[PDB]
Symmetry: C5
Subunit: 250 residues, 5 copies
């Protein structure tokens, strides 16, 4: 049971905070200008350790050059850039076997349901899922419907669809976008069934209070917790705010 392994490692207190840091490929270093220390992966690991968070998410290159075993690692296997303009697609730049050798306790993979290339990711996810079982590493699916008929990505029915697809394809945990309110988000949590749901943190909010409120409703909806990047490390008071998030979530 890989969900149970995931919960044991990443949610020992019953809830989870994962510090996400795949943004260097997905968005590029413009994300790091607000708080320049955020460009240094060593600063990120220190933030995770000092705030008492459960994990970090790195791409293979960051894991290879910087990962030191100090916080449980989810190795994000695929990645794309915002420079890309086609139908959404993100392919693996790392195998599960290599993730294991880099010290990962879980692997991550993004799918874009609805994309003209949805099939390419489902096909590749099949191989990754099989390897995840073989190496006994939980699979965490970033389920982000995009392209095709998707217009609003945070619409209640799209997020619920995202959650269900991750369950159906074999996710042991999932990361999905927040709908903006606990009632509609709890439907997504419900259709995910036994698979725990992490809220994606999203763009830095106008105030810290706005994000604490989002996180409050995420927990009320029954989610396991949050996978947060920008709303922590884009802030110059990153550590202070991270510890307030820890207080709220645990």
């Amino acid at each position: 049971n890989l969900t149970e392994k995931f919960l044991r490692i990443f949610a020992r207190r019953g809830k989870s905070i994962i510090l996400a840091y795949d943004h260097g490929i997905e968005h590029g270093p413009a994300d790091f200008m607000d708080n320049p220390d955020s460009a240094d992966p060593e600063y990120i690991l220190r933030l995770a350790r000092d705030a008492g968070f459960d994990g970090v998410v790195f791409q293979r290159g960051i894991a290879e050059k910087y990962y030191d075993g100090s916080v449980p690692l989810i190795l994000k296997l695929n990645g794309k850039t915002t420079l890309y303009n086609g139908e959404p697609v993100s392919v693996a730049n790392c195998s599960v076997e290599e993730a294991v050798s880099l010290g990962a306790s879980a692997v991550g993979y993004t799918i874009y349901p609805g994309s003209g290339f949805e099939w390419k990711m489902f096909e590749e996810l099949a191989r990754i899922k099989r390897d995840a079982v073989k190496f006994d590493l939980p699979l965490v699916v970033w389920s982000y419907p995009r392209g095709g008929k998707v217009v609003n990505e945070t619409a209640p029915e799209i997020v619920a669809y995202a959650a269900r697809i991750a369950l159906e394809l074999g996710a042991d945990a999932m990361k999905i976008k927040y709908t903006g309110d606990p009632k509609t988000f709890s439907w997504a949590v419900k259709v995910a069934g036994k698979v725990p749901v992490l809220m994606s943190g999203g763009p830095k909010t106008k105030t810290e209070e706005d994000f604490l409120k989002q996180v409050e409703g995420v927990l009320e909806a029954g989610a396991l917790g949050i996978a947060v990047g920008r709303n922590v490390w884009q802030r110059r008071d990153a550590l202070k705010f991270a510890r307030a998030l820890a207080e709220l979530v645990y």
Copy 2:
């Protein structure tokens, strides 16, 4: 002879009712709003068992997290979403070998004859068929002509073509759409030859009677039975109606 194994497991009474539940990925959870318990796979298994049905159809993730051995399982290997807009294509997210380990007694695969991508599914079906023989698991093909010159999916000649394609490609059993009357549907059944035909239930009918009459025409046409989803679990009297279906079919 894998047709005979299929009949022994899924049609021990001489006719078959399979409760289909791949809808989480195919349509998403909007299908589950009419009868919210339908979002829970545990509820689906209870329902199948209590109505005395012959099997359930799950995607790999639902099988892994929920399947308990209580009703014979057809593991549906491929899936796509309705969010997708390209030429119809659905790729495997699971192998036959993995289906075996999840407790499947048969595997399912959808083809869309006529699609700009028909070749991609025929290519993949070739590998799945070979594996099905190797692992001695019957292959059930969902034969759904779509894309290309397909303008009307329930037209007599399209359904008959669907049925014949499934036979020609190596299906041990098949699932196809109803034409709306027993005379035309019996042509589809005839061209399928030794391979048994299950009617796809389709959208929830206006009345329960309408669906019973379809079912009385399907059986008259010489089909093995039905693979039904929505017309059972979308109804709040799901168990009562399921038992009426069992009475009629068995």
Copy 3:
């Protein structure tokens, strides 16, 4: 020498008649309405036997469910539908190794020279040819230029091109379209060199005498014989006409 093996099995009398029956996938069951027994593969095998023909052509599913060893089998490895609208392509749904296990004495494969996807079929034919040598099964190529600059598939220069391409790619025997007269067809036969040529029967002719004249022309051009489907089994006097064909060819 696989051509010699082909001739020994399928042309023991010096000429050949092969009863083709891959139409169920290629054209669908509308082909079977004229003579409804033609939908039954058992009837096809009895017809081939009773007329004293040399072989039958089945797709894998028909071979698996119906082939009984009573007439030598050519297993047609690839297939496409008429529902398909793209640039012509037909991919393998079966391997040579599986054809061997189903009792085939030869394998068949269609190429569409000129298609936007000509390369996909040449690539796959390379693998099939290599396996045909390895399993010592003659490879029979259906050479049907289509797409690209091809307009009339029966023009003398197109049929001769078809024949030459089959020879160059390694066919041990080939099936090509008739040009409509023995002089032009004999050029196609000549450029095929040591590889024997079977005439594709084509659509059911207006009279029996018309088809018989085509066959005579084919034999005068130096072809090995005919691979005929519709002009035999679409007729309600199928067996009687088949025996007249046998009289003419042998």
Copy 4:
């Protein structure tokens, strides 16, 4: 050193004449109407032997059915037709290992630099090159820029680019188009470095003297020799003209 092996087998006199005969697939049998014996590969082989040429180029099907060991063989691994309309692409229909078993002393492969599919042929050439080294067979690259920005295939800069690409990708010898004069062609020869250059013969010239003047210029430019097809076997005085070519080149 596979270039040295190439020169030992195909250029024992210090210069080389190769009789090319892949035209059956590339152009089809219309090429053979001028001199109908040219359609017979046995005639081609006799012509090569009687004129004292160094080798022949055959596709796999011709080699398998006709090659008798009498003249060194270059097995042309890839081929396309003129019926094809897409961006130029030619895929392998044969492996190096099979070429070895057919009696080849070298393998040939066409690339079309500039094509929208240039990548598909570079990817495949990588595998063929690796195999050629493993089986110790020289790789002869037909370097024919086509598609993309290429509009004048015989332009000095295009032919020089063709030559250099073949060197960079690992060719042990190469075949390229003539620029029409020795000065510009000698630049292509120079950028090819240690890799010997064979001139592609091209369409049959108006006079035998026109062709001899191009051959003179190719020799003046420092090329190894010619790979000639049509300008020999499309002529009814093929043998006589072939012996005049031998006189000039050797």
Copy 5:
């Protein structure tokens, strides 16, 4: 640690000059007309050696026919032409295992982030990276955003993105385009973290002084050095200018 192996071989003096010569496939021989000896890979090897440069970059065919062990080799595994017109893509024509047998001390691979085919190169890079680790050969990534939304390849934000992508995908060293000034380029160097950055030399500058100034700024920005092709071997005084570059990079 393959970055450390790269630095030991290609940067023993603390900075690096690599003489790049994959241009025969990428641009074709028009690049060689200015200084015709440049078409001869032997002249190139003599040039790197006589100027005391750290390495050369060759495609497989040049390495097989000409490489003589005299200067460390980076085997550039993929290549495309300028004749090509589609969305930018460059596929491997050589494996890491073959590079090892040809005498390479490192392997090079170009990615074009933003291309409609970016996924094809990331997919292939994954296999090459896995083989580089297996054969213990440093992977040098040419990170050149092109296609998609990219309209200015030397814009500060594009170059910084290029640098970060190379780090994220597993590069042990990288080659990226210069932004034209040391302040913006130093942001690219910073986001590259522990992975060293080599400046791509670019088109031959109008004066030798212009190129030196670009190199000065690259060094000031904290880069490891330069991978230069045209700005050396396209010049008739190639050796003299190469030695001035050596003075500036290893010395200045």
